[PDB]
Amino acid sequence: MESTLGWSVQDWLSFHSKSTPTKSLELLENLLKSQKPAPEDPAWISLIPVEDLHHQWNILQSKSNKEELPLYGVPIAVKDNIDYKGLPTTAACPSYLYQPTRDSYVVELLRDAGAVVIGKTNLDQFATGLVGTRSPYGKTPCVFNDKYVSGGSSAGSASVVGRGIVPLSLGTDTAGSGRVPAALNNLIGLKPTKGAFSCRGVVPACKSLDCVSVFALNLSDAEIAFKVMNKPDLLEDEYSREFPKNPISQYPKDLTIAIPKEVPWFGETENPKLYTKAVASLKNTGAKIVVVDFEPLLELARCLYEGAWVAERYCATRDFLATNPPESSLDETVVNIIKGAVKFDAADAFKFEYKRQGILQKVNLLLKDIDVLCVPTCPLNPKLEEVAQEPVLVNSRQGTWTNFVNLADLAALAVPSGFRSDGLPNGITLIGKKFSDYALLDLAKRFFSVAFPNNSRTYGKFVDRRITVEDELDGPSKDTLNGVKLAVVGAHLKGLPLHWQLQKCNATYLSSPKTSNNYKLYALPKVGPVLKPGLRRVNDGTGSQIQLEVYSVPYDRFGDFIAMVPEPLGIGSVELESGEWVKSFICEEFGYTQQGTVDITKFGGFKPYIEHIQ
């Protein structure tokens, strides 16, 4: 039949719509057959049985609104860290193996959205490392060159996406594990705001810091996965937290992007070139780039490394370690790290927690006037043998830019910046404050269109395919709004010189209806260099339908918007064509009752009129 390697989610959905339930089952059965487990393919700890593929697919057929399921019959991989009930969970530790009787909340959500889990994916043992070599199941290679490391700890999940077996996969990230493998494999790596994705059914390893993360080939698919898994789960995950309403969806073109004053490369010469060029490209989107001392952030990173956070991994594994399981089941570097936790008492954990809170005061003072950090994802592209030689120091260095994100309650999106001379990829990570995940996506989109002009952007190993349409975003869905419905008629319309005031207050365009038959529109005597209309509700009988744009203005922001609204205008209510009332600009009678006032109703809107002039 037909090749499936490197399909977007959209590619998969298109197939399903135009195919029959049996010929789409076959395509997945066929994808499943081409995969190999165990040591043959180090990327897979385990793969589903054909019976299980049938089961998932039957369940899928029972649901009665497919073609509204944004991941209908789309295959996905899951880090062997995260429970799927159809397969065992291992944490890349053969004797730790266990059978979950229930799905991760995250997996359960993706299944509800129509996806099919194909296998569990290999990782550094107990999700401990940035290298991907620390698994008794095998070392996963870089999708581009088998001499190189895939990155970890989410190594299987990057590999599998990088070569387009599957268009989305799940990883986890405490201090880099969803970001480093994206850079080494030409992927999108989304590390969401903490507590946004539930960690119910993931094996705890630094519970207080840990996030479920996603890999994708493109912005579009990372967005669909985010919308699917961003769901509260307060009573079953102690660190879950609900996204607030009115999430920002775009940074201003003007945004302050901070970069570090000192960028250590540890001898590496190719990667600096990609970073320099990437910063040039951000400047060209119109961003303000500001160079900033990252001292406090690095103090925070050191606090991670010096502190007792290792006691979190130890807490999740000590009962198990005391079981004394066969040495061959264990990675020794991992186990030595985890046992570093024994030398810390409760008093110690607190002492470091104090120091962490103190650093954060400094970190919060620093970020107050910055919108985003742009950081190299990792300094190196490690060779398999380089990390065999120095099995700890390579790891430390690969966390140069990753270690402080979760401690500081930030979000992050690792995104390609191009290729070095030797044809390996790397890239940048963009770090935003709590709940900016949607705006980071969009910022990547804007970065891409400059760094990869003329649709020249590659993805995964697919060095000779180009992104056309797949990096486009819907933005946050209307579900998430909670604001006043506001109708504008004048200088706040798209394209006129007060539109920005709506953007400043994080307004969202809803629609463009007309008033009912009840309205006149005036042009007022110009005084500023801006001309200003006023609406008049009338009932002699002689009104027209005036044209409007309607915006949702977040409740907490409406104060900021109305404060910019000078006499004689005001905010009242207006009647739309359909009979709904909606807040709107109005005008004191004194306003349109001056010498200089011009009856503009004729034009049916304010645009038409500001063109019959200029």
Place this chain on the structure above:
Amino acid sequence: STLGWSVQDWLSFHSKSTPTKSLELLENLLKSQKPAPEDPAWISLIPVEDLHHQWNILQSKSNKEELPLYGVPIAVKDNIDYKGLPTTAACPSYLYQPTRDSYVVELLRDAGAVVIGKTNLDQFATGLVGTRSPYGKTPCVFNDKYVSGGSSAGSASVVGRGIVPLSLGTDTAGSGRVPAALNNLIGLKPTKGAFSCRGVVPACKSLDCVSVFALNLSDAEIAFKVMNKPDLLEDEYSREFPKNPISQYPKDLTIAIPKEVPWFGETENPKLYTKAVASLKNTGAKIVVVDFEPLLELARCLYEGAWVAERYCATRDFLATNPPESSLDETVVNIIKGAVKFDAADAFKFEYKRQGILQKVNLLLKDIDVLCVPTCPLNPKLEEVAQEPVLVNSRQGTWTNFVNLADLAALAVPSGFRSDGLPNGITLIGKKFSDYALLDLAKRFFSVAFPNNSRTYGKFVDRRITVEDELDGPSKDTLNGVKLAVVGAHLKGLPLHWQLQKCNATYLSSPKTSNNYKLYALPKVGPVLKPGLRRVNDGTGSQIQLEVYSVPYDRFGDFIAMVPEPLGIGSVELESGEWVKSFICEEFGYTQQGTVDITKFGGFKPYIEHIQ
């Protein structure tokens, strides 16, 4: 003579008197005080020359009568640094000499106050009893067979006897609350992070609060305003209060009381609680009966769990010097030494459990403005504590020990006397930053529970509060909002005024428009009559009375959602020429049949009165 004076009493003496007489008054006060053990309440008193030094510094300040604590004597817990006295934490061998004031003492000093002494406490602030000190066991201000309570023992006694009208305590698990109940005081336990902890000895650093004992609400408030200041770089748990702090709960607010109230045998204190609840009901407040189990789960955590290690963290380099056994209190040191039981791994295990409980607590409190709780179950005897050095202490903790873990604010307030003559009280608990609304809720509770100006204070069973529980609310520098003129149903006393309170609006003034304005009564549809303002291009316009309010930027959206056709918010020009947001009205509004031109009345209230 000076005993039982309030802050205002001190201020009014000073402002009528010479610096010299003012000094003598303070001197006589200092003279008449004794340190421990003659008086267990005081660990040390300032030497007379320190008094003069402090006085001379005060004389240097150029604006004196702006200073809200000018020449006002205060006590400080021997937990907190004042540079002219040593710090001890009630451990003689722990004694050190600070270089500088704690930030909190420095703020109060800048506000005028004179530190008179360092006050006695349970050693290393561990306990709610007051008795675990080698400098002595501070007695209840009512009866020296009874415990004063702790750990802010001396602070409570000194204010109970009215030597000083304010004292600093600290509070991690009740230490600013229990002693207030047992001595007929107000105990304020501010929102975490509001009062800096720079220069206080840590004992449970991540939960610690500096706190305040007063005799009346006014003083608690004054003190609160002086010390509620950020100190972000010198105190890792400092946090800035946001703008527009609420000043008052609605008449309506929901107050939760526990479904299960254990008393441990006590027969007297339940009657005062019952009575207090009935007083709250009578203020207009809706009482709901609520399952406190997850809050008591939380509070256990503090005891069974790893927070005990914060104390050990604070205290262990010292303890490894094996100081003399007789400077140590055995109960306390053993409680602290129990921290060796816990791994870092254990500390995280407990932290997860805490975060799990807080998910349940935060959900349970979305519905609720305030928790009302018995301050402590018991009025323990010294003897009872001697027999049960651990048991009584923990029963005294049954209501106190979840507050900081859960990041809440508290105010312990009197509720009357048992038949006994011993006092007790209620602690009102609110969410973060509610400190001003908590004080106002106490005012309201007082006016029902102690009608006709009958409230007692401290040992002063024969005096009555008069004006000293009144409040200024947050000061104007706290607000950040849009100035808004109302002309209509949102005026004070009028039917829509609740909508300003709902949006946390603050009254600023009652100015008039310029003479540019007409006012119409709109046709009456609802059972609410509403006016419409109209500006004219003259000459006919007249001046309309307004009320102007600060509406938080935050809340303005909430406010406008309540404003229907044909009204709107635009701007109006005051008599002063200042423009300001206000209600305006569509043309159509005042052009309907039945609109009455009402200008002649000068405003809306006089018109409503010409109808009734």
